[PDB]
Design a protein around this nucleic acid. Structure first.
Length: 580
DNA sequence: GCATGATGCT
DNA sequence: AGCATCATGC
């Protein structure tokens, strides 16, 4: 039974009411400089569909869009906001975003369209986007009658679902999390994505050139050591040359066939000169394929800029994800990949890259939530946490902790974070489980408060059905009651870890909001470019560096008040590579 | 078209 | 942990 609506030929005053559900449809997944396919407005006066060419050319409609006092409820308003920024139009007054409300209520649902969110409340009078647009190749905008009905039905759902969603968010004590955190953050992310990051493609093209040289050299060497040419990129052909032709030991297998996993080849290293070349070849290869060739594909030729899209409603912990390209995983660990960061430059002459990062925010958050005296005292002293952990679990003085001891205490801290899995520890430390488990027990002896928190949180997750973060983000853990050891075990590790990774996500999001408010009050030209989980990257005139050196760390450190201090380090330079 | 398995980051 | 991407290959 079709839904009633006016298929408008011109904008009317009726369509410019004080409150409305608004749909500004951008069908391309990547909404940067993309077409707006149609518009729908549902308010107390009715339902309307507007062709974009006419409404976006109407001064009253554009003014209504930018009027902060004209409240709009939408689904993924960041997508619309950015598609409109590319058209020189400002979107304001978005007081409710259904995608974000759904995400906060339950991130595991995987809500990615209005139909998915509506189903959460037994509302199914709207179709899934995939159903009307199709998938991949066959994707396509349908004819106006079909298109117009779909947009109006989506707008009507938002109009109807706003109250029940806000009601549940309030019961969950998540209303402010939505209104004061995620929604204001959405607008900040829109500015970042729209601004983009400048790329020195000539540099990138020079690197790919040398990398192509190296690659070819290591690849030929590998054919020598193997005695024949094969597809090094095929773990299949790889596994046969290593474990059959060269008879290397099988220390590990995969579902079917052999495992050429990274650390397996690490173990194999000692036996053959070919293993080191395959690992090096894999390193240069990832650099070439993903970070030179892949990057170059998404750079806009007109501006030499790259515009990521931050998925704000995907992760189970409250973290953001980044795509097309992923700017949260640019190489930094090994020096050869790190050089890729030389290609990321300021978008204006005489401007520089400024990067600030939290120092151990997770362990600091853990010290705070577990209220572990030893852990809190360690951060209050701003101690090297890995040396301090080594001192404690190995029972030696700072003087006697050796590099191998620190590396292992560091391994327990890296693991500790993510629910401290001893099976995974043992593999990381390449030790037996009984030994890994021994490390863990010595940790809990030294950090009793952390032990108690892990126990208490697992009990809570069981009792309530979910765990929450500092700012009330929530994660349901149905598997924590499983009678299957493994399944139940993972959920218990999520119960321990989510409040840690999730609260750190909360903290840095609030810092971003606080920072932009300060940057504006100061009328600084400096602005955010990226966020990579525990660090913020900006660019600004070289003349603003000194003010930034003082402003950025302070805002980040003061975003929330914990039982221990928050510490932020920062650097700046002429390329991302130099902001170190 | 997909998943498998691999590397990259926090 | 759990994100995103890319090459293979069925």
């Amino acid at each position: 039974a079709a839904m009633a609506f006016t298929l408008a030929d011109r904008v009317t005053e009726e369509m410019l009411a004080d409150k409305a559900a608004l749909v500004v449809e951008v069908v391309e997944e990547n909404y940067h400089d993309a077409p707006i396919v149609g518009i729908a407005v549902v308010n107390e006066h009715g339902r309307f569909f507007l062709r974009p060419e006419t409404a976006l050319a109407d001064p009253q409609f554009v003014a209504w869009l930018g009027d902060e006092t004209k409240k709009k409820s939408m689904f993924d308003s960041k997508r619309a906001a950015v598609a409109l920024k590319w058209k020189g139009i400002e979107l304001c007054g978005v007081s409710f975003d259904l995608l974000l409300a759904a995400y906060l209520l339950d991130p595991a649902q995987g809500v990615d369209d209005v139909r998915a969110a509506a189903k959460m409340k037994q509302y199914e009078a709207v179709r899934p986007d995939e159903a009307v647009y199709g998938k991949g190749a066959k994707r396509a905008v349908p004819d106006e009658p079909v298109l117009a009905e779909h947009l109006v039905r989506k707008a009507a759902a938002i109009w109807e679902l706003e109250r029940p969603f806000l009601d549940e968010l309030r019961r969950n004590e998540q209303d402010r999390l939505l209104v004061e955190l995620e929604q204001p953050l959405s607008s900040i992310l829109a500015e970042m994505e729209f601004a983009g990051v400048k790329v020195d493609t000539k540099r990138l093209e020079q690197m790919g050139k040398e990398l192509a040289e190296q690659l070819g050299t290591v690849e030929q060497r590998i054919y020598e050591l193997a005695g024949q040419e094969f597809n090094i990129n095929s773990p299949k052909q790889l596994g046969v040359i290593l474990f059959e032709k060269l008879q290397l030991p099988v220390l590990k297998k995969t579902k079917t066939g052999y495992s050429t996993s990274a650390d397996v080849l690490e173990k194999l290293a000692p036996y053959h000169e070919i293993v080191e070349n395959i690992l090096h070849y894999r390193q240069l290869g990832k650099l070439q394929s993903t970070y030179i060739e892949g990057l170059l594909k998404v750079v806009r030729p007109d501006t030499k800029k790259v515009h990521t899209i931050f998925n704000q409603a995907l992760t189970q912990t409250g973290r953001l994800s980044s795509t097309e390209p992923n700017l949260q995983n640019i190489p930094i660990r090994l020096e050869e990949g790190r050089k890729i960061r030389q290609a990321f430059v300021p978008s204006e002459s005489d401007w520089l890259i400024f990067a600030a990062d939290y120092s151990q925010i997770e362990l600091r958050v853990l010290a705070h939530i577990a209220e572990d005296d030893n852990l809190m005292e360690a951060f209050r002293r701003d101690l090297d946490i890995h040396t301090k952990t080594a001192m404690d679990i190995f029972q030696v003085s700072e003087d006697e902790v050796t590099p191998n001891m620190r590396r292992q205490a560091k391994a327990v801290n890296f693991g500790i974070v993510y629910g401290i899995s001893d099976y995974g520890l043992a593999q990381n430390l390449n030790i037996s489980r009984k030994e890994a488990a021994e490390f863990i027990e010595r940790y809990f002896e030294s950090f009793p408060g952390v032990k108690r928190y892990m126990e208490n949180i697992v009990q809570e997750a069981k009792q309530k059905g979910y765990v929450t973060t500092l700012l009330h983000r929530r994660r349901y853990l149905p598997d924590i009651t499983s009678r299957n050891f493994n399944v139940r075990s993972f959920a218990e590790r999520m119960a321990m870890n989510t409040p840690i990774q999730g609260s750190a996500a909360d903290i840095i999001k609030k810092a971003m909001i606080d920072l932009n408010a300060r940057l504006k009050e100061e009328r600084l030209q400096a602005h955010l470019l990226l966020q990579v989980h525990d660090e913020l990257i900006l660019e600004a005139p070289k003349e603003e560096m000194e003010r930034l050196c003082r402003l950025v760390p302070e805002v980040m450190e003061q975003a929330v008040t914990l039982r221990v201090p928050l510490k932020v380090d920062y650097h700046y330079g002429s390329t991302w590579y130099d902001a170190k």
